[PDB]
Design a protein around this nucleic acid. Sequence first.
DNA 1: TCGGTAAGCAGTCCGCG
DNA 2: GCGGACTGCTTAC
Length: 902
Amino acid sequence: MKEFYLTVEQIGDSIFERYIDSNGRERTREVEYKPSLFAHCPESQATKYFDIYGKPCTRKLFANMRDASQWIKRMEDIGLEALGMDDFKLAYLSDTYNYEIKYDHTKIRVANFDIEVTSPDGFPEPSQAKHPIDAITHYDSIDDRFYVFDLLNSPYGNVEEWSIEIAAKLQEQGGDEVPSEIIDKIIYMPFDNEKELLMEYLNFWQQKTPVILTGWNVESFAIPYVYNRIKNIFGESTAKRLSPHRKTRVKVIENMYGSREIITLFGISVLDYIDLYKKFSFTNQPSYSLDYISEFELNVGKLKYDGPISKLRESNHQRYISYNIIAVYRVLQIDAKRQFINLSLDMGYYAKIQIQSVFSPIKTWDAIIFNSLKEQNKVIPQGRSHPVQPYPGAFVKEPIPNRYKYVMSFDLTSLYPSIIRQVNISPETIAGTFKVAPLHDYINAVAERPSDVYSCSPNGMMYYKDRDGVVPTEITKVFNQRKEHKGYMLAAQRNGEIIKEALHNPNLSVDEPLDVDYRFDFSDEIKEKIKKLSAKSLNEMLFRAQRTEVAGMTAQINRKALINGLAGALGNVWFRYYDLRNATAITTFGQMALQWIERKVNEYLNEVCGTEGEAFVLYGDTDSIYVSADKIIDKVGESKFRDTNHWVDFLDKFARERMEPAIDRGFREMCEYMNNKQHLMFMDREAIAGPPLGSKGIGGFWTGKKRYALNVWDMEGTRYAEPKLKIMGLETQKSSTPKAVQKALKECIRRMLQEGEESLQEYFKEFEKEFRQLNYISIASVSSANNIAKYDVGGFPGPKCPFHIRGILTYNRAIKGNIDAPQVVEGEKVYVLPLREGNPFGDKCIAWPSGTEITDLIKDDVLHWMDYTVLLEKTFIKPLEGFTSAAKLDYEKKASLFDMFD
DNA sequence: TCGGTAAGCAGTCCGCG
DNA sequence: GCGGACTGCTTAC
Ligand SMILES: Nc1nc2c(ncn2[C@H]2C[C@H](O)[C@@H](COP(=O)(O)OP(=O)(O)OP(=O)(O)O)O2)c(=O)[nH]1
Ligand SMILES: [Ca+2]
Ligand SMILES: [Ca+2]
Ligand SMILES: [Ca+2]
Ligand SMILES: [Ca+2]
Ligand SMILES: [Ca+2]
């Protein structure tokens, strides 16, 4: 097989590399890598190395990496560009793996671990590590085993061994319900003392050294706690055995508010699953507890135990260990679904970077572009310092707040990357500038043609047309990968809808789910067999289809994120290829493109309708337009349609056969106008929205920019079994809105769009009457909590104190003295409730850690003093009043001549 | 939050005769 | 009471 790296490090003048050799074995080597860097040289000197602008360079070979680094410094001292890859491990990887890397994941040791630490005096701080580590569960991907290290004797109590028999049993048998599929994979090791446990853990680690190290909050808790505890008991050298090269750094993580400390383990790639989840999931969650996220992702119940976690080991050690094991497994289950580790490996090996660098799109793209240029013997420029400067972004149309009955939306495929490719925007393709007219003049095609030679953006920039820039070349490659995975995602989605349809008529039989590839549209043969399947098999197929859709979503959305990040990186001062001329060339072209096509679509539809100056495009944001289709429907007449699906078909056909050709024509003209390299503005129909045929549903409404709701029957060619609400920006979509309120507001919107005003009034009346019964957590607001200390003046709110911070301060005063009280962690999320006047907390609100029940000693008082009226008006009524006034509807029945008469 | 801009709403402070 | 000048937070792209 072809070799591939696992990890790479620079330690002084040595590269330390762990890799898989040509026989599939894991090896480690120390390499005295001699780096090269570059200086400009005279043209009269013969060379094969050129910078990106075509200027000749001489290669400088250094005796070692420190010499190379010193040379960079002296070149700065002289005032001359020091060209080349200054991150020497990236150059090493480029030299050592000069081909597209094919990796074998089965050879990569992925370790998932979690530790437990009993602490009677609050949160066990990783920097202090003053409490014994009393449990470690460490799952190894190569052995496919859970290695359980269990401390039986502690200063906080001596316990009996954990029982695998009880662990397996149902919670109704007094057991812990450790999943049957992992029971046989547990290797249980009890220890009579902590020193023995840790020494054995280190010997184990030495034997089975993680390449990828993950788990939940491992980077901020488990890793620094283990490191520091071993350091405290044994000394630093023993703690450094967590690094295969025995090198670590206590590294400070800084942002804006403060700083925290993590431990860098050289020769390990830490991908904390919480960080993977935050980067790759495209969710914003009210809580990031593993319980909370496992419930969201897997629909598994919260791990139930009695009393505080600080007493769980002594009171129920059996459950303590079982929950430690289950916790490790939950992360594995989340990964089986989301496939973020797979994603990270894919992107890391593609870029030829340390796997953990996938968190940095700037590092990722720097390596991609470097490797690409190096193939042509081209030489990358030195990174430079730039002051942070603001620059313009997208255009967003101001909508008229209103109901909108029939709506067809259209959206440009991968806009910013497509602009880059179309215009040929790259550091080395800049050809010059032209004299800019107001943007409006380009939109309306009255400005002079920018260039007859170069490819242009309406920000004034011109680009070469003779050859693709490196940025267009490399962005195209990832765009193509993205396109493939999106295809699989959409097929799985369409396939899921077939199954949902079939589930209306389940067959009464015992059978099996079909063995199919959900990434490809079901054949007629499959469709016929599905129509004969039982509900049990159908539901299993649906679950599998949706799992396939999730896998495709992960693969596509994050490749989209990477390519959009390249467009964004051009406007980040830390990017080697930072250039506001290029960043703005992209955003300004986008502004023109949207407004250009708004004009074209309005012109086309006014033509087919035989009107003048009518506004068909009601809205647009960045790269999308929303077209009113009322007149199109009305041209055939509602009564002519058999059912909802009939007008949906008609609009779909109209969009594809009439509107899309007109859209393409408009964009080809714009391409010629800007003299672009290649027409890539592809705007396809996205949504077809409207009320159910013959109903009083309003179909949709806008309240303002980035705030709307649509009843969608077809999205990107997925025809839904049941209509789906597309809601953007409204409170139902915000993590800050209480859970039960999101749900209620969603149902109000559903009723408005599908059923009408009367249905809405019926539901409002009911919610208003019953809501005080809702669980306090479900009606709590949520907020991130930054700068708590900043607004704290002797335990009370300082000037300008935010509402949620006030709640935290109220909480802090209420828990002064309570030993079992959780602390609010700076920068994390909190639940927030309003409090009625004259409450014993002495303020108008209280806040506590999100994803948790409020501590028992104040819970009863909070419940008693919760201000339901304020809660209702602020989270439910105010937003609903916003929705209904926009839609010209009333959520309460107004008086009529029938009232109180006949 | 260690890792692009536009723009919405909550809330504080305080004017607005 | 609402709206502007702010801070804070969160979402649409
Ligand atoms: N830097 C950055 N830009 C974004 C992000 N989301 C959207 N944009 C910008 C770049 C996109 O091309 C443009 C339009 O956003 P869309 O959500 O429609 O995505 P896009 O057109 O790229 O892909 P698509 O084919 O429609 O799924 O807005 C983002 O998360 N980060
Ligand atoms: Ca735990
Ligand atoms: Ca788009
Ligand atoms: Ca059937
Ligand atoms: Ca869009
Ligand atoms: Ca098309």
